[PDB]
Enzyme design. Structure first.
Site, mmCIF file in Angstrom:
data_model
loop_
_atom_site.group_PDB
_atom_site.id
_atom_site.type_symbol
_atom_site.label_atom_id
_atom_site.label_comp_id
_atom_site.label_asym_id
_atom_site.label_seq_id
_atom_site.Cartn_x
_atom_site.Cartn_y
_atom_site.Cartn_z
ATOM 1 N N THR A 135 -9.091 -0.774 -19.829
ATOM 2 C CA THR A 135 -9.452 -1.784 -18.868
ATOM 3 C C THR A 135 -10.345 -1.408 -17.665
ATOM 4 O O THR A 135 -11.051 -2.272 -17.084
ATOM 5 C CB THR A 135 -8.538 -2.792 -18.573
ATOM 6 O OG1 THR A 135 -7.299 -2.139 -17.974
ATOM 7 C CG2 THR A 135 -8.166 -3.546 -19.930
ATOM 8 N N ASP A 179 -29.777 11.264 -38.517
ATOM 9 C CA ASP A 179 -30.181 12.020 -37.211
ATOM 10 C C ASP A 179 -30.836 13.189 -37.731
ATOM 11 O O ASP A 179 -31.756 13.565 -38.652
ATOM 12 C CB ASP A 179 -28.973 12.141 -36.116
ATOM 13 C CG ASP A 179 -29.299 12.325 -34.928
ATOM 14 O OD1 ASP A 179 -29.735 11.499 -34.196
ATOM 15 O OD2 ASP A 179 -29.510 13.495 -34.536
ATOM 16 N N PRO A 216 -32.603 -7.722 -34.435
ATOM 17 C CA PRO A 216 -31.562 -8.415 -33.913
ATOM 18 C C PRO A 216 -30.340 -8.376 -34.934
ATOM 19 O O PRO A 216 -29.137 -8.642 -34.365
ATOM 20 C CB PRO A 216 -32.162 -9.956 -33.930
ATOM 21 C CG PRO A 216 -33.305 -9.979 -35.027
ATOM 22 C CD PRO A 216 -33.872 -8.559 -35.011
ATOM 23 N N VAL A 221 -29.042 -5.916 -36.250
ATOM 24 C CA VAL A 221 -27.935 -4.693 -36.104
ATOM 25 C C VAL A 221 -27.218 -4.760 -34.773
ATOM 26 O O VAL A 221 -27.420 -5.655 -33.967
ATOM 27 C CB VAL A 221 -28.866 -3.404 -36.551
ATOM 28 C CG1 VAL A 221 -29.599 -3.440 -37.736
ATOM 29 C CG2 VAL A 221 -29.716 -3.179 -35.189
ATOM 30 N N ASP A 243 -26.608 -5.887 -27.502
ATOM 31 C CA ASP A 243 -25.462 -6.361 -27.880
ATOM 32 C C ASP A 243 -24.160 -5.849 -27.288
ATOM 33 O O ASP A 243 -23.210 -6.564 -27.005
ATOM 34 C CB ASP A 243 -25.113 -6.192 -29.355
ATOM 35 C CG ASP A 243 -26.237 -6.729 -30.399
ATOM 36 O OD1 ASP A 243 -26.170 -8.088 -30.353
ATOM 37 O OD2 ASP A 243 -26.887 -5.707 -31.046
ATOM 38 N N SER A 250 -28.574 7.103 -26.970
ATOM 39 C CA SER A 250 -28.290 7.893 -28.249
ATOM 40 C C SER A 250 -26.800 8.454 -28.385
ATOM 41 O O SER A 250 -26.216 8.518 -29.317
ATOM 42 C CB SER A 250 -29.156 8.885 -28.560
ATOM 43 O OG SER A 250 -28.746 9.855 -29.544
ATOM 44 N N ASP A 289 -17.968 -5.950 -16.413
ATOM 45 C CA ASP A 289 -17.462 -4.584 -15.305
ATOM 46 C C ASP A 289 -18.541 -3.610 -15.116
ATOM 47 O O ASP A 289 -18.339 -2.664 -14.443
ATOM 48 C CB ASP A 289 -16.233 -3.806 -16.153
ATOM 49 C CG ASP A 289 -15.337 -4.901 -16.860
ATOM 50 O OD1 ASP A 289 -15.197 -4.744 -17.748
ATOM 51 O OD2 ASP A 289 -14.630 -5.499 -15.860
#
Length: 279
Positions: free
Chosen positions: A16, A39, A175, A177, A200, A224, A260
């Site tokens: 946290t 990749d 949108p 993914v 997201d 990345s 946060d």
């Protein structure tokens, strides 16, 4: 389980609070899940992968990671020391050459490869793809990432390191993914991380220690490097039965550390990936 003196990003995803150095996680550790690292390849012989990494596809003369970026991402997904999901299987898809570049048709083919290849693998707990790559907006690259997601793979993609709105980048702007921004150890948005309403979730992206080629390690920065934390986290949560591929990005955002992060532009989510593990 507790990993003392873990990299800060692993400790952050189980905390946290910033500033701790122990990674806590359920010992299932993504066993029975699979993560494709799309990749520059994976140095599968790196002792940190313990036989759990393998190259499954390359579009170049070698499958061998001649760059280090793909190895570094795979290590944040699933290496024993630097990995979120320490028992997951890692499948390397080399769509980027050894300067880390790839034509977009090769990237699209690799994504379609994964959507089919997962039917050749044993992933009873589910499948994740980590896409630590990107360039300009492409509707065909967005649609390839959407197909992959649609096929039942959690797709996690980097937001991009342009310090700009990720709407102009692909596959970040797709949108369906899970578009991942980068934060630093002080819970600041990384200075390079893209942002915008298409993001997201944020993950650790600045000064991330992980495997490197030549059996080495090193610390590098990038959205990345935030992406494999989220990919790894998804594999971990799927193995625990907490979520599925279709709903993992939503679940991760629902259970994330909220509010946060600092220097999050208005209209971008203030959400930091969090495994919510109670030891």
């Amino acid at each position: 389980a507790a990993q003392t003196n873990a990299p800060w990003g692993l400790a952050r995803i189980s905390s946290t609070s910033p500033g701790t150095s122990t990674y806590y996680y359920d010992e299932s550790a993504g066993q029975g899940s699979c993560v494709y690292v799309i990749d520059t390849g994976i140095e599968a012989s790196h002792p940190e992968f313990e036989g759990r990494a393998q190259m499954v596809k390359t579009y170049y003369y070698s499958s061998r990671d001649g760059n280090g970026h793909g190895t570094h991402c795979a290590g944040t997904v699933g290496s024993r020391t630097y990995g979120v999901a320490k028992k997951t299987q890692l499948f390397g898809v080399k769509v980027l050459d050894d300067n880390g570049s790839g034509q977009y048709s090769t990237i699209i083919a690799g994504m379609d490869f994964v959507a089919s290849d997962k039917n050749n693998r044993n992933c009873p707990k589910g499948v994740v793809a980590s896409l630590s790559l990107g360039g300009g907006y492409s509707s065909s690259v967005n649609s390839a990432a959407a197909r992959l997601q649609s096929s039942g793979v959690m797709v996690a993609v980097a937001a991009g390191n342009n310090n700009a709105d990720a709407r102009n980048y692909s596959p970040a702007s797709e949108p369906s993914v899970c578009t991942v921004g980068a934060s630093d150890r002080y819970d600041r948005r990384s200075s390079f991380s893209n942002y915008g309403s298409v993001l997201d979730i944020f993950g650790p992206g600045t000064s991330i220690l992980s495997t490197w080629i030549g059996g080495s390690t090193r610390s590098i920065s990038g959205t990345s490097m935030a992406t494999p934390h989220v990919a790894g986290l998804a594999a971990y949560l799927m193995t625990l039965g907490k979520t599925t591929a279709a709903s993992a990005c939503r679940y991760i955002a629902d259970t994330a550390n909220k509010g946060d992060l600092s220097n999050i532009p208005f209209g971008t989510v203030n959400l930091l990936a969090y495994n919510n593990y109670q030891a």
